[PDB]
Design an enzyme around this catalytic site. Structure first.
Site, short mmCIF file in Angstrom:
data_model
loop_
_atom_site.label_atom_id
_atom_site.label_comp_id
_atom_site.label_asym_id
_atom_site.label_seq_id
_atom_site.Cartn_x
_atom_site.Cartn_y
_atom_site.Cartn_z
N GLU A 192 0.82 -1.21 0.00
CA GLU A 192 0.00 0.00 0.00
C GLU A 192 0.85 1.26 0.00
O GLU A 192 0.55 2.22 -0.72
CB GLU A 192 -0.94 0.00 1.20
CG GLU A 192 -2.06 -1.00 1.09
CD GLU A 192 -2.78 -0.92 -0.24
OE1 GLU A 192 -2.83 -1.94 -0.96
OE2 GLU A 192 -3.28 0.18 -0.57
N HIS A 210 -14.40 -10.98 -13.66
CA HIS A 210 -13.93 -9.94 -14.56
C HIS A 210 -14.63 -9.96 -15.91
O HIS A 210 -14.57 -8.97 -16.64
CB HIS A 210 -12.42 -10.07 -14.77
CG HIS A 210 -11.62 -9.86 -13.52
ND1 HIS A 210 -10.92 -8.70 -13.27
CD2 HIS A 210 -11.43 -10.66 -12.44
CE1 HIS A 210 -10.32 -8.80 -12.10
NE2 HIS A 210 -10.61 -9.97 -11.58
#
Ligand SMILES: *[C@@H]1O[C@H](CO)[C@@H](O[C@@H]2O[C@H](CO)[C@@H](O)[C@H](O)[C@H]2NC(C)=O)[C@H](O)[C@H]1NC(C)=O
Ligand SMILES: *[C@@H]1O[C@H](CO)[C@@H](O[C@@H]2O[C@H](CO)[C@@H](O)[C@H](O)[C@H]2NC(C)=O)[C@H](O)[C@H]1NC(C)=O
Ligand SMILES: *[C@@H]1O[C@H](CO)[C@@H](O[C@@H]2O[C@H](CO)[C@@H](O)[C@H](O)[C@H]2NC(C)=O)[C@H](O)[C@H]1NC(C)=O
Ligand SMILES: *[C@@H]1O[C@H](CO)[C@@H](O[C@@H]2O[C@H](CO)[C@@H](O)[C@H](O)[C@H]2NC(C)=O)[C@H](O)[C@H]1NC(C)=O
Ligand SMILES: *[C@@H]1O[C@H](CO)[C@@H](O[C@@H]2O[C@H](CO)[C@@H](O)[C@H](O)[C@H]2NC(C)=O)[C@H](O)[C@H]1NC(C)=O
Ligand SMILES: *[C@@H]1O[C@H](CO)[C@@H](O)[C@H](O)[C@H]1NC(C)=O
Lengths: 97, 597
Positions: B357, B487
């Site tokens: 992150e 997806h």
């Protein structure tokens, strides 16, 4: 303030760059193209005054800073505003200067 | 009084207003995401629709400047990224129909149910339980039932919707001069007018097909090893010269093989490094991990945290009642505000996700000087690669034995080397064939090379030809297997997961040469080496200002993506594998089938 502080403006559209130490308060519509717009917002005619969105959750570099610029000047006046010194005490019965 | 000098005048005002409205909308979205209440939902939706309407009005206004006379390249990039009509070029009825069918597809994927043939009142959704049975079980019939029912009771609903979504997207893309919807997707890697870095949309297919041709000599050996090991968990079900049944791979579709590691561990008597008892018995809290990550990032030469990041970010899970969906993300609310949201615990996986992150956070901090429309990765694949190489380098024993989590000596042996490399291979090189195949199939469908009466046949033919798995039950032209993927049903692009895997290792080998490494590539660290930080920051601060094939050169030295770094990274496992298949048969034949008997 939270939810925005729209009371601090800054003009970003001017036809000519400013000469040293001049102040302008005009609010006429800056006309970018070739067609007259007679003073209404729209296409190629923008309003030149916009406002900072000041909010407390900003990073250093977008928080509002206050500035105070001092300027000094000596045209011709002999005795004017001057800083204070030390009032040399007055002695007596002793010659020197 | 020219058609160029008006572009900058308009772009300045657009940048200002857009930054303001985007900050408002993103702050509302965060206020919802970290505090799930009822009024926050509408408070977020209001700002969202306001920002969307403003962007739409600016888009329909910016069509007054023809892109043919613009000479500067940055303003051209901004105008072209703002000018694209996108959707809404259709009529109104078609747009309503497309939105309705997209919402229906997403809803059907999210809330599908399948229950037992002997007890019809115990059906489970996908997420809480189906991909758990498919991930933890070891029974043949149970996995087969799950894999067959999830496609027979939920896939059969998506075909009459997909057969219309295809046509609608084809029309929406042909109304913008793209010749199909696939070219619209590949239009991200498009580069025009640089005189030395040109990249036409059509060369992406050739590049992908020419780089995948060098991975097969490794994927074949990995496949042969996985098969020779799987033939001991389910005997008399796999033949030594056939493919792998598509339900014994580890999850619902076979995208990652990482759940097989319990069956195919080479040396099952050496536990790989897991510093989780040291972190717990040394009293590490949720803030020490981020302090260590910030120290690691400041070691290489990147700036400190903005100090607005420690006061507002949500590093800990709020206890009593502050129910908040915490999937770790890094936010870029704008105007110098960067925040991180994750319910961290004290383990190793979160210790790596913190570095991942902070990678995105450093990236977003670097290019915060560009205009608004150019605040993004060089393309759709740079962001995750930049965020991933950090966590790749933050788990090597040399790095963990200097922070304090490990003993200072910790004698090393090549067995743990092989263990770690193989656990890495079952996730990195195990998904590239599947990704390439699915993208090739979707391209060949959208372009029109596969008539709508030959979908499933060609899909399973390509799966037998490329990936190396075979269906366990015949599938006729009523089913729809590709739509059963997340997806594919929600209209997300998929080619980025194939370019990220290459960019990651290219960046890693490029930076590891600046720190002057000595041993193999998988034992390197870029900490304490200031030149690596400079070489990386030379690319971080660009954004979308330059074509991506330029920002790729500044760090590596080439113009296109390559595949030599990946094989250089996997060389040791490659050798050990090549010495493990003296008696087996590397490869597969496309004739055997689990029902042809
Ligand atoms: C999370 O959202 C809820 C709902 O808005 C907040 O609850 C109220 O928020 C208002 C807004 O200032 C306060 O005036 C009330 O006193 C709050 N009520 C309660 C019972 O707390 C809640 O405050 C939000 N969470 C945080 C940490 O502010
Ligand atoms: C038009 O192009 C020129 C160069 O092609 C840009 O000039 C750069 O401007 C930035 C900031 O204004 C400077 O930091 C660079 O040093 C300039 N480059 C050169 C070579 O002088 C110019 O910015 C472009 N126009 C706009 C509106 O961005
Ligand atoms: C974007 O969509 C518009 C229609 O919404 C396309 O058509 C142009 O629209 C403008 C605005 O009414 C007309 O003045 C033009 O005559 C239209 N035709 C043109 C420009 O050929 C527009 O072409 C689309 N632009 C792109 C880049 O797709
Ligand atoms: C990066 O460099 C720093 C400074 O050179 C290293 O920190 C010192 O490492 C030595 C080696 O054992 C210790 O004796 C010192 O106590 C450390 N100093 C501090 C302040 O902790 C650091 O270990 C290096 N890191 C890597 C991964 O090489
Ligand atoms: C790990 O390294 C050791 C040596 O450091 C390897 O052991 C040798 O393997 C060769 C291969 O035939 C033998 O001829 C030697 O006799 C072995 N040495 C000893 C002392 O027995 C071992 O094979 C390596 N293992 C892996 C998986 O790389
Ligand atoms: C970063 O912060 C630490 C402590 O907060 C400080 O010691 C260090 O000098 C800072 N470095 C930079 C580049 O700001």
């Amino acid at each position: 303030k939270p939810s925005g502080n729209y009371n601090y403006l800054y003009r970003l559209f001017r036809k000519s760059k400013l000469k040293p130490f001049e102040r302008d308060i005009s609010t006429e519509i800056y006309q970018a193209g070739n067609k007259p717009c007679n003073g209404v917002a729209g296409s190629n005619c923008y309003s030149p005054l916009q406002s900072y969105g000041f909010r407390p959750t900003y990073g250093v570099g977008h928080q509002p800073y206050r500035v105070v610029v001092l300027s000094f000047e000596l045209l011709h006046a002999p005795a004017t505003v001057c800083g204070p010194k030390k009032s040399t005490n007055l002695v007596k019965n002793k010659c020197v200067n | 009084s020219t058609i160029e000098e008006q572009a900058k005048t308009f772009l300045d005002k657009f940048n200002h207003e857009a930054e303001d409205l985007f900050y408002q909308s993103s702050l509302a979205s965060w206020n919802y995401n970290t505090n799930i209440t009822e009024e926050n939902v509408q408070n977020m939706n209001n700002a969202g629709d306001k920002w969307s309407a403003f962007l739409k009005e600016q888009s329909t206004l910016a069509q007054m400047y023809p892109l043919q006379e613009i000479q500067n390249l940055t303003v051209k990039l901004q105008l072209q990224a703002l000018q694209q009509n996108g959707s809404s070029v259709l009529s109104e009825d078609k747009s309503k129909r497309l939105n309705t069918i997209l919402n229906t597809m997403s809803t059907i994927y999210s809330t599908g149910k399948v229950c037992n043939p002997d007890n019809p009142q115990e059906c489970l959704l996908l997420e809480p339980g189906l991909n758990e049975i498919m991930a933890n079980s070891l029974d043949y019939n149970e996995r087969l039932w799950a894999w067959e029912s999830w496609r027979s009771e939920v896939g059969k609903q998506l075909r009459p919707l997909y057969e219309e979504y295809v046509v609608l997207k084809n029309e929406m893309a042909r109304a913008n001069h793209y010749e199909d919807y696939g070219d619209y997707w590949r239009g991200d890697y498009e580069v025009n007018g640089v005189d030395g870095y040109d990249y036409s949309r059509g060369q992406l297919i050739e590049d992908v097909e020419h780089t995948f041709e060098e991975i097969k000599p490794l994927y074949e050996h990995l496949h042969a090893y996985v098969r020779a090991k799987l033939m001991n968990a389910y005997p008399s079900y796999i033949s030594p010269i056939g493919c792998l049944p598509a339900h014994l791979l580890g999850d619902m579709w076979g995208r990652f093989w990482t759940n097989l590691y319990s069956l195919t561990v080479p040396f099952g008597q050496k536990p790989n490094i897991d510093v989780t008892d040291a972190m717990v018995d040394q009293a590490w809290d949720a803030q020490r991990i981020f302090k260590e990550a910030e120290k690691f990032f400041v070691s290489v030469g990147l700036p400190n945290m903005t100090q607005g990041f420690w006061e507002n970010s949500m590093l800990t899970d709020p206890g009593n009642v502050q129910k908040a969906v915490c999937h770790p993300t890094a936010w870029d609310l704008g105007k110098g505000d960067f925040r991180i949201l994750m319910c961290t615990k004290v383990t190793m996986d979160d210790f790596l996700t913190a570095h991942h992150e902070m990678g995105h956070i450093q990236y977003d901090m670097a290019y915060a000087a560009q205009p608004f429309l150019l605040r993004n990765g060089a393309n759709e694949g740079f962001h995750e690669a930049v965020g991933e190489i950090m966590s790749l380098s933050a788990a090597t024993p040399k790095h963990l034995k200097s922070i304090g989590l490990l003993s200072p000596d910790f004698q090393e042996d090549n067995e743990t080397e092989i263990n770690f490399l193989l656990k890495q291979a079952l996730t990195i090189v195990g998904t590239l064939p599947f990704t390439y195949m699915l993208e090739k199939w979707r391209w060949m469908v959208f372009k029109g090379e596969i008539p709508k009466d030959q979908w499933m046949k060609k899909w399973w033919e390509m799966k037998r030809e490329i990936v190396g798995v075979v269906e366990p039950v015949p599938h006729d032209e009523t089913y729809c297997d590709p739509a059963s993927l997340f997806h594919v049903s929600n209209d997300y692009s998929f080619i980025r997961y194939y370019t990220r895997t290459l960019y990651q290792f290219q960046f890693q080998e490029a930076l590891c040469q600046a720190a002057k490494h000595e041993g193999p590539l998988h034992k390197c660290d870029i900490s304490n080496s200031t030149e690596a930080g400079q070489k990386l920051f030379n690319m971080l601060r660009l954004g979308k200002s330059e074509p991506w094939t330029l920002a790729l050169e500044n760090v590596v030295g080439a113009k296109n993506m390559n595949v030599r770094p990946l094989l250089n990274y996997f060389e040791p496992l490659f050798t050990w594998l090549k010495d493990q298949n003296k008696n087996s048969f590397v490869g597969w034949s496309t004739d055997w089938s689990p029902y042809a008997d």
